[PDB]
């Protein structure tokens, strides 16, 4: 299983200036829950934006050029990234935009957080489509103290 996980604001915006500007702790907790113990594949820009390894997960970074940090695994292409994950049930792809574009045709599951927020955005989630996917999970939550915007968690299976 190749799965993508992403948090999208309105108009499918996922980032700006190579950052996530919004602070939504409930969604981070959901991200950790759904990636714990799994391999995670990310692009080099996302690597520099998170800034650090992610604990309890095998961190795989796509980059066309020599890696600079042996606390993670560097790979030069998509199939190399897949091979490096070994024999895991579920391979999590955690972005960013250019990497999501390449892995979407090979994914069978999408973990999406739809955030009710407008964010001027430098990068977007790939434009998917009304008919390749059906929902297996809905969980909507209003804004509270720690979380300033409402958000929907959705899991989608490739039909
Ligand atoms: N809302 C969310 O859930 C979410 C999730 C993740 C990221 N983000 C945001 O997304 C933005 C970053 O996304 P991005 O599209 O600019 O970059 P990205 O996808 O994270 O990384 C692009 C880089 O990854 C490498 N790469 C991609 N495909 C490759 C391939 N087939 N082979 C070898 N290397 C490959 C290349 O590294 P080299 O250039 O070194 O060759 C490429 O420059 C940030 O704003 C981040 O905060 C948001
Ligand atoms: N749903 C979703 N939300 C996101 O914010 C998200 N972010 C990325 C890329 N950026 C990041 C940035 C920070 C952390 C992070 O610090 N996570 C900690 C949280 C620990 C905790 O919740 O206490 C982690 O260990 O997962 C993860 C991904 C990729 N997919 C996503 N997917």
Cα–Cα–Cα angle for 70, 73, 75, nearest 5°?
125
Annotated binding site for substrate: 5, 27, 52, 57, 113
Gap between the terminal Cα atoms of the chain: 14
Q: How much distance in Å is there from the Cα of 142 to the middle of ligand 1?
A: 30
Report yes or no: 100 and 6 within 8 Å, Cβ to Cβ: yes
Report yes or no: 97 and 137 within 8 Å, Cβ to Cβ: no
DSSP 3-state assignment of 1?
coil
**Cα-based torsion angle of the residue sequence 128, 132, 138, 140 in order, rounded to the nearest 10 degrees:** 20
**Residue located via tokens 């009710």:** 116
In angstroms, the CA 50 to CA 42 distance is 10
Q: How many CB atoms lie within 10 A of CB 129?
A: 7
Nearest ligand to residue 34 Cα: 2
In angstroms, the CA 8 to CA 133 distance is 17
Q: Strand pairing of 109-115 and 151-158?
A: antiparallel
Counting from 1 in the atom list of ligand 2, the atom nearest the Cα of 113 is 1
* Residue from 31, 91, 94, 139 to probe ligand 2 pocket by mutation (most atoms less than 8 Å from CB): 31
Q: How was this structure determined?
A: X-ray
**Resolution for this model in angstroms, one decimal place?**
1.7
């Amino acid at each position: 299983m190749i799965s993508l996980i992403a948090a999208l604001a309105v108009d499918r915006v996922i980032g700006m200036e190579n950052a996530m500007p919004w602070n939504l702790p409930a969604d981070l907790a959901w991200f950790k829950r759904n990636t714990l113990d799994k391999p995670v594949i990310m692009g080099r820009h996302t690597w520099e934006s998170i800034g650090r390894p992610l604990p309890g997960r095998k961190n795989i970074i796509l980059s066309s050029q020599p890696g600079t940090d042996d606390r993670v695994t560097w790979v030069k292409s998509v199939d190399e990234a897949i091979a490096a994950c070994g024999d895991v049930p579920e391979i999590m792809v955690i972005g960013g935009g250019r990497v999501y574009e390449q892995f979407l045709p090979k994914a069978q599951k999408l973990y999406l957080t739809h955030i009710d927020a407008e964010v001027e955005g430098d990068t977007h989630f790939p434009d998917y489509e009304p008919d390749d996917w059906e929902s297996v999970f809905s969980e909507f939550h209003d804004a509270d103290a720690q979380n300033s915007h409402s958000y929907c968690f959705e899991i989608l299976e490739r039909r």
